[PDB]
């Protein structure tokens, strides 16, 4: 059976090839997770189809209904067999889906427009002139809502009540807002994405301060999928062989234009 | 039932307290893994006894007999219920034991005596005046014994054939060898241990170069153990509370004396 892979359009993980209208199926896409999907499928011995998550979301549970959206939702409700995307391993997600060992490390980080007078999360929390926000329906927002760490809870208190809204629906929207706002919007997003964007034209953003936490992305499968075990062994093999490092280099740094 | 925890004397993960005499059982020990064990035990709801691996090794499989030694062997042969130690997640181990998601990241690194004229692994490989080696029965030696990277394979060819032997039985022996060889021995070990030692008196070693790979330590249980699931959930939770970040600062940065 063709394994249905859910993923998300997020650079440089999955992107539309420039001539994708003349290509078919998996060939329409390129990027880190496209290359990785090919390798996981080869080492696990399955055929597969890449499908972009319909609602364009990573995955969170609605607080009132308790329905999961995004890629998590496609797995939970049986629409996809596997997710190969920059999907963060979290405890609440682990209650409903399974994750491989992580294939890439990351932490929450701060993106500013160059010259913004902020060097840290503590800096951000202590002022109001520069607004700051995070992506909707993702692990970064949930991180702040739940955190018991003084500085991060102070940030949550501000963000949840800030008007106009400081949350964005896609990473690209957040990045554009940073670039537009003349230094008055900072964006909280994962270090991997922050680092990619810093090396992309117009080279007008940068990552400041240390990461706020330390986690990783995992390949996710529905609970009790037969695929879980083989996928995990494939991730370990590819790490040890050096593939993951090679792919990071290909899509981040060899890709660099600043 | 009291859970038998296997671990290994390795700073700053598990150390006999200087002062101890009036202490018994688990109380004799201190360290990152000692603190982590107490947290895992509290979140999983079990009592436990810390035991130091009998053969003082992490664990490797004998090529001729296929018997596993070290902490891995203690799990495989049913001599302990769980290992809580800086035990590297590897493909060959995952075939015989289960690991939690990683609780700490590390990479292979180079330790020199300060002033040694080496800045990289490439430097080591291209010369012969300065000897170099690694720990026996651990993941670092296997890394080299398997690597296809030109520089690392060149290092392997040298190390496996060097006389006298460049391999050591314990990390402490490796560190002593660096300290007392006047810059003529360099030691390959994990970044975590290297960075700890660099901030300890006599402050005469340092980490040079970047890491050679990127991996993680996991909590290990015997295949199919009934502890596995609860332990993984606990590592997830401790990470998201930040407790793991807190213990890292306690045992690395608060321990600095240089
Ligand atoms: N390519 C790689 O080597 C990346 O793999 C790793 C790794 F080896 C270690 C870590 S430590 C950070 C926490 N480990 S986790 O991401 O599996 C996690 C996430 C949330 C709760 C508990 C544990 C990270 C990597 F990505
Ligand atoms: N990687 C995140 C999405 C990005 C973010 O939340 O910053 C997740 O899995 O939800
Ligand atoms: N962490 C290693 C031990 C130290 C080393 O090999 O450098 C292991 O689990 O085997
Ligand atoms: Zn391959
Ligand atoms: Zn004593
Ligand atoms: Zn606790
Ligand atoms: Zn033998």
From Swiss-Prot, chains A, B:
Residues under site feature: Crucial to convey clamshell closure to channel opening: 118
PTM-bearing positions, type Phosphoserine: 147, 181
The organism's place on the tree of life at top rank: Eukaryota
PTM statement from Swiss-Prot or TrEMBL: Palmitoylated. Depalmitoylated upon L-glutamate stimulation.
Residue numbers marked as site, Interaction with the cone snail toxin Con-ikot-ikot: 61, 145, 237
Expression across tissues: Detected in forebrain. Detected in dendrites of neuronal cells. Expressed in the pyramidal cell layers of CA1 and CA3 and in the granule cell layer of the dentate gyrus.
Residue numbers on the Extracellular membrane side: 117-258
Subcellular compartments: Cell membrane; Postsynaptic cell membrane; Postsynaptic density membrane
Induction and repression of expression: Down-regulated in the pyramidal cell layer of CA1 in the hippocampus by global ischemia.
Binding site for L-glutamate: 86, 88, 93, 139-140, 190
Disulphide bridges, residue numbers: 203-258
Domain notes: The M4 transmembrane segment mediates tetramerization and is required for cell surface expression.
Family: Belongs to the glutamate-gated ion channel (TC 1.A.10.1) family. GRIA2 subfamily.
Further remarks about this protein from its record: The postsynaptic actions of L-glutamate are mediated by a variety of receptors that are named according to their selective agonists. This receptor binds AMPA (quisqualate) > L-glutamate > kainate.
Function: Ionotropic glutamate receptor that functions as a ligand-gated cation channel, gated by L-glutamate and glutamatergic agonists such as alpha-amino-3-hydroxy-5-methyl-4-isoxazolepropionic acid (AMPA), quisqualic acid, and kainic acid. L-glutamate acts as an excitatory neurotransmitter at many synapses in the central nervous system and plays an important role in fast excitatory synaptic transmission.
Description of how the protein assembles with itself and partners: Homotetramer or heterotetramer of pore-forming glutamate receptor subunits. Tetramers may be formed by the dimerization of dimers. May interact with MPP4. Forms a ternary complex with GRIP1 and CSPG4. Interacts with ATAD1 in an ATP-dependent manner. ATAD1-catalyzed ATP hydrolysis disrupts binding to ATAD1 and to GRIP1 and leads to AMPAR complex disassembly. Interacts with GRIP2. Interacts with GRIP1. Interacts with NSF via its C-terminus. Interacts with CACNG2, PICK1 and GRIP2. Interacts with GRIA1 and SYNDIG1. Part of a complex containing GRIA2, NSF and NAPA and/or NAPB.
The protein, known as: Glutamate receptor 2
Classification of source organism: Eukaryota, Metazoa, Chordata, Craniata, Vertebrata
Full-protein residues shown: 414 to 794 of 883
